Paper text:
Using LIBRA-seq (linking B cell receptor to antigen specificity through sequencing) data for the B cell repertoire of an individual chronically infected with human immunodeficiency virus type 1 (HIV-1), we identified a lineage of IgG3 antibodies predicted to bind to HIV-1 Envelope (Env) and influenza A Hemagglutinin (HA). Two lineage members, antibodies 2526 and 546, were confirmed to bind to a large panel of diverse antigens, including several strains of HIV-1 Env, influenza HA, coronavirus (CoV) spike, hepatitis C virus (HCV) E protein, Nipah virus (NiV) F protein, and Langya virus (LayV) F protein. We found that both antibodies bind to complex glycans on the antigenic surfaces.
To identify the binding site and define interactions between sugars and 2526 at a high resolution, the fragment antigen-binding (Fab) of 2526 IgG1 was co-crystallized with mannose, and a 1.8 Å crystal structure was determined. The mannose binding pocket was stabilized by interactions with the adjacent light chain complementarity determining region 2 (LCDR2). Mutant 2526 IgG3 antibodies, whereby combinations of the residues lining the mannose binding pocket identified in the crystal structure were mutated to alanine, displayed dramatically reduced binding to HIV-1 Env, SARS-CoV-2 spike, and influenza HA. Since our data indicates that 2526 requires complex glycans on antigens for binding, it is likely that there are additional interactions between 2526 and its target antigens besides those identified in the structure of 2526 IgG1 Fab bound to mannose.
Numbering used by the authors:
A (entry chain H): 1 to 52, 52A, 53 to 82, 82A, 82B, 82C, 83 to 100, 100A, ...
B (entry chain L): 1 to 27, 27A, 27B, 27C, 27D, 27E, 28 to 214
The structure:
């Protein structure tokens, strides 16, 4: 099975360099182009450049040339994207991608899961998790964190039906907040636990939500 | 660079019915070798793009055969023969005849369903949060359709403004509804000056606005 497994979310200071990775498996690494694509939040897709790993032949979008460098390490079938000096405008989701066939570039097929890059002067802040206590409805309020993202699951992933995890809202304090809710049978009120992870701040919480 | 123009940018459609998206390039995508270097992708909420059609008209492996592509030169069309609920998301074309590759702006497919009223729930702030001097009051509007909905916060029947924020989910892939949360934020000092906290919800599925409320400290 083809896999493009990208490195985790990054928060960096302006002016810093950065290199993100795309670990490939399941196919002949050396004879498939790997392309990098930017997606600004809620926006479209912009092609940055690509590399043929066999001989590190590259082709760049002129608007990104010199701003980024693409490279590979064949020994671990991994491609890289590097900024010499990050700017605030580089805050975005970045994808790696692979054409349907080996050899000449014919467009894209497989996409990595994406790497979120946040360029900020601010220090990381972990969330406080508060209960939304209870068809009944209940959930968790994940308040005051930076940067994105946070993940939320319910009962270690065992409760998925009826869950709605909302888009984060940016508060006037400059910090994010989000809510996750679930509707459950009124008769049960079962043990309900929201699992919150904010990896940038090593914050991990399992809040029991009770009436 | 080649400019890719997609139309419409927003596409309402009903499951079972056909749907079709146009992608027009400023320059021919027809290679000397006879192939048109145009691929179609679907990007579902929170996911990476997934290939649907490559080289103009080849269905990618695993794509349901209700998806098809056609066109040549500068005019291309993605066609869904019988839309399903699960097809909600954004659709993109990409050309690969000229460096740099360029994408259309994306067509957002919205799945039409019958009007559905929200179930409304109100949540007072937790005792834990009130310790820290802020009060977040949350109003949940669950599983409604269409997306337009008005949430009105009232504190001791006084209309609030400037102290709330809203977040809305993407259309559900199975039932095609939306959900919305509104959070009213007050200082602990302001929260304790008042008794009745209410969110009033206006929506097409409701004959009259629906109000959920609580009295501070009483349960
Ligand atoms: O909406 C149809 C849909 O079917 C599958 O479930 C998905 O994996 C997509 O690849 C495809 O577009």
């Amino acid at each position: 099975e083809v896999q493009l497994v990208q490195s985790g979310a990054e928060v960096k200071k302006p002016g810093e360099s950065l290199k993100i990775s795309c670990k490939t498996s399941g196919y002949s690494f050396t004879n498939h182009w790997i392309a990098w694509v930017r997606q600004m939040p809620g926006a479209g897709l912009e092609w940055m450049g690509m590399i043929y790993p066999h001989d590190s032949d590259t082709r760049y979008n002129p608007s990104f040339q010199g701003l980024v460098t693409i490279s590979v390490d064949k020994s671990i079938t991994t491609a890289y994207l590097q900024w010499r000096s990050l700017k605030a405008s580089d805050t975005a989701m970045y994808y790696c991608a692979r054409p349907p066939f080996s050899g000449s570039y014919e467009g894209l097929d497989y996409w990595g899961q994406g790497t979120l890059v946040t360029v900020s002067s601010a220090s990381t802040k972990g969330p406080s998790v508060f209960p939304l206590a209870p068809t009944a409805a209940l959930g968790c309020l994940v308040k005051d964190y930076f940067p994105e993202p946070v993940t939320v699951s319910w009962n270690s992933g065992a409760l998925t039906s009826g869950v709605h995890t909302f888009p984060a809202v940016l508060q006037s304090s400059g910090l994010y907040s989000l809510s996750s809710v679930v509707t459950v049978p009124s008769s049960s009120l079962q043990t309900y636990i929201c699992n919150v992870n904010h990896k940038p701040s090593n914050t991990k919480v399992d809040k029991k939500v009770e009436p | 660079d080649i400019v890719m123009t997609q139309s419409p940018l927003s596409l309402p459609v009903t499951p079972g019915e056909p749907a079709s998206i146009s992608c027009k390039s400023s320059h021919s995508l027809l290679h000397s070798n006879g192939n048109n270097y145009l691929n179609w992708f679907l990007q579902k909420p929170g996911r990476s793009p997934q290939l649907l059609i490559y080289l103009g008209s080849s269905r990618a492996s695993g794509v349901p055969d209700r998806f098809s592509g056609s066109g040549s030169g500068t005019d291309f069309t993605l066609k869904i023969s019988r839309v399903e609920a699960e097809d909600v998301g954004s659709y993109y074309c990409m050309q690969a005849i000229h460096i740099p590759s360029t994408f259309g702006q994306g067509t957002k497919v919205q799945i039409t369903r019958t009007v559905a009223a929200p179930s409304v729930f109100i949540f007072p702030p937790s005792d834990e949060q009130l310790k820290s001097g802020t009060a977040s009051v949350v109003c949940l509007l669950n599983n409604f359709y269409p997306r337009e909905a008005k949430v009105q916060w009232k504190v001791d029947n006084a209309l609030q403004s400037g102290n709330s924020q809203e977040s809305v989910t993407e259309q559900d892939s199975k039932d095609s509804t939306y959900s919305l949360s509104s959070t009213l934020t007050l200082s602990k000092a302001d929260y304790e000056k008042h008794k009745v906290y209410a969110c009033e919800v206006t929506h097409q599925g409701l004959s009259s606005p629906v109000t959920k409320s609580f009295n501070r400290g009483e349960c």
